[PDB]
Design a protein around this ligand. Structure first.
Ligand SMILES: *Cc1c(COP(=O)(O)O)cnc(C)c1O
Ligand SMILES: *Cc1c(COP(=O)(O)O)cnc(C)c1O
Ligand code: NA
Ligand code: NA
Lengths: 453, 451
């Protein structure tokens, strides 16, 4: 049996058509270095997605690899249960609290972003029980938001592909509108008037459900997996006013935006969010180890702490919570981002990426070019006036991502939008090569469609 | 400014009283080797729990550490989404399918046991929707079962500490009896008659709820975190007959029993279980990396595969699913357990542990000694005739576990029981030292409770 035949025989793949997988088999990735990965045929690709929006320092950072070795040879596993602790969890918790964009009290560690958001749901229910508000339990999130895949975190998620066939969302998980002006604003509506209408939708949902029943609002500052959706001017200001009016917690899901993706250290800084709770993962460790972190402010911590005393202990934790190798690698990762000024470098490389894509702004298949910092998308359309797709919605995105792969670049299609999220270490020539491979894929796609006009 | 002060300032601890933590601070563990860990004052402890029921090869296995280094220097991260793959995920999936105790079709990888059980809930809902049985969605688990801490997996869990204050369980997550003869059998009742009554309870729950509404039954072959509870003779045979009668999936939660804990490779082998689905973690990697695995049989795969075609793709996955460093370490871990014959070594060390503890069967505070393979527990009581606690349930267990720590041994209290789950590499004199530190803690506890 070949390695490809064994893959087909033995693995159920995430985010894959299992029947199509039995016919086509895998694309096997063998090795990586810098911004590049190589398949088992020796073909090289720029990883323009940094894997899954995550590999901040690229695929061969020797400082992360040596940090792992040193921790393995000291203490390769221990836990944080029943007052037990270890140095790497303590030093990473200190660094995260001291770099937070608003005053924060404590860190709780998990393996995944999905586990982290699931834990935030439990901690908010625990808190409101502790404060004697047993009705204050409902969550509000947005259409096309992504918050993970557990029964609870996939209920917060607003992408139908995460819910159809899974009996989700659960009761008490509500959704308001996707803040994408290009797709959901009225003809001739300003960004500010769109933001007004979204803030009115939220207030009317709160009043309809009963304000006393609404615990929390969760959002990505900029929505990643749902299409690199930049919210309209004044959205976060007006949404937070409505939340503060009804005593609703604001949760910033920073799993993609965290650690320099949007032009500042946090999406909360870029978009003027003052959250009660932050969720972090992905670039936290450059995905070299599975780890996520929850930051909670003083009021959230004090209520949980009171209830943990009354009930004997906090009845929650994962075996891997604060894993000493994962925390050691994340701590070294954050030191490198600070020491090499990668937040400022990423902001400069992002201006070059956006300028390169903007040469195609009057192309007949280019509907919108969006992003900020070092995250971007180009949304393709069959018709710029109607914004209608070529053939079925998703046809241009799938064709573009296939052509990009042929031209030695891995990008991700989100319907008809193709994404860019390269490693923070990308250099000026490499940004040039990313835009060149985009341009070759667009030329291929244009010849296939034949726009005329 | 001290490391302990920083811990108090910045960390919320799992399974901890946060206010008591602000007063006492942490016990900081600095380093480990073999079966030992050491605190920041240089004091050494036997890790009689193998960390969290998990560190099978001990705290200094150089083969696992080199396997990690080699994978880091090749490909330190990639994913399995959208047909992408990599060698360590493929070779581990092959090894897990070929070593399975019943015929299995496919592996799906997660980071944690909690994520794995949560994923099994979603996959069973997805399957029954695919088969046109939209009502067949309810799960049955047991009192004192432990299946993890997500909103869904803590609903499967049967321990009140995991549910009180969290508004759990969710609707459609049902619980039948804990199969613990010492606590729940009627006066006189044999193990076989206890098993009969538990099988009748399950059948009556299924009929009361509507058989067409019941998707799955989940159980640990023996219950770990809920008290090291060995089920009575004939339990698993009779429960499986009832499940097969109403077309109910049997899920074996092997997160603790997996890879030689119970005297055979799997708890399913020890207890004669033929599951449709298995869940694995912990000893899978000796916890050197966060990883868990779901094994599904042919019928479960064929239904999920058809639905993934109809809906365009399987709308489920974790960033870390099949992480190449975690899969590389787990693959090397399973090779070592096989090459060093640690299933048979663990079985021999387990007989020594259980025979050593049995010397204390007639101690006035010992209610029950239980175990199988290299997992055991001693339950203390304030009165052997009534089986009543001293003061309140948990008072003896808290004091016992604290005295064991003073005597250089880390054990875990489960109410008034203390647990034993040492690394599989434990040697004969090390088992002797574990029993001796238990004995010193028991002497201390006896003098404390006093006349
Ligand atoms: C990727 C992601 C998650 C989920 O993280 P996993 O580690 O894959 O469970 C949650 N929120 C956002 C915004 C994400 O991008
Ligand atoms: C520990 C455990 C789990 C949960 O594993 P985590 O990795 O801590 O989420 C599930 N089932 C059983 C039987 C366990 O012992
Ligand atoms: Na470079
Ligand atoms: Na050491």
């Amino acid at each position: 049996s070949s390695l490809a035949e064994k893959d087909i025989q033995y693995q159920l793949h995430p985010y894959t058509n299992a029947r199509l997988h039995q016919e086509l088999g895998p694309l096997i990735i063998e090795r990586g270095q810098g911004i590049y990965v190589y398949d088992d045929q020796g073909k090289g690709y720029i990883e323009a997605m940094a894997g899954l929006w995550s590999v901040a320092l690229g695929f061969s950072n020797q400082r992360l690899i040596k940090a792992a070795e040193q921790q393995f040879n000291t203490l390769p596993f221990y836990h944080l249960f029943n007052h037990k602790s270890h140095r790497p969890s303590i030093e990473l918790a200190e660094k995260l609290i001291e770099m937070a964009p608003v005053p924060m009290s404590k860190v709780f560690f998990t393996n995944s972003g999905s586990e982290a958001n699931d834990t935030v749901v439990k901690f908010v229910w625990y808190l409101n029980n502790a404060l004697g508000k047993p009705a204050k339990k409902k969550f509000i999130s947005r259409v096309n938001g992504y918050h993970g895949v557990t029964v609870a975190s996939a209920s917060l998620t607003g992408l139908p592909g995460n819910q159809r066939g899974f009996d989700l969302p659960l009761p008490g998980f509500l959704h308001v509108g996707c803040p994408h002006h290009y797709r959901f604003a009225l003809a001739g509506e300003s960004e500010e008037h769109f933001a007004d209408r979204l803030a009115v939708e939220l207030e009317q949902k709160i009043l309809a459900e009963g304000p006393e029943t609404i615990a929390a609002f969760i959002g990505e500052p900029l929505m990643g997996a749902g299409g690199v959706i930049v919210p309209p001017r004044t959205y976060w200001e007006k949404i937070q006013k409505v939340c503060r009016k009804y005593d609703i917690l604001v949760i910033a899901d920073e799993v993609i935006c965290g650690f320099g993706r949007t032009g500042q250290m946090f999406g909360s800084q870029t978009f003027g969010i003052q959250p009660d709770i932050m969720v972090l993962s992905k670039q936290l460790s450059s995905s070299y180890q599975p780890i996520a972190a929850i930051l909670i402010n003083a009021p959230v911590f004090e209520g949980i702490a009171d209830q943990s005393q009354a009930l004997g202990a906090l009845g929650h934790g994962f075996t891997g919570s604060g894993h000493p190798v994962a925390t050691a690698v994340a701590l070294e990762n954050l030191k490198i981002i600070e020491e090499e000024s990668l937040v400022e470098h990423a902001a400069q490389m992002g201006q070059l990426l956006r300028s390169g894509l903007q040469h195609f702004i009057d192309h007949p298949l280019v509907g919108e070019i969006r992003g900020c910092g070092l995250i971007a998308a180009v949304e393709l359309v069959g018709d710029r006036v109607s914004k209608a797709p070529y053939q079925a919605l998703g046809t241009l995105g799938r064709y573009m991502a296939g052509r990009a792969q042929e031209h030695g670049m891995i990008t991700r299609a989100m319907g008809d939008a193709v994404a860019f999220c390269p490693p923070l270490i990308v250099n000026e020539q490499e940004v040039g090569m990313i835009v060149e491979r985009f341009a070759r894929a667009l030329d291929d796609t244009t010849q296939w469609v034949g726009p005329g006009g």
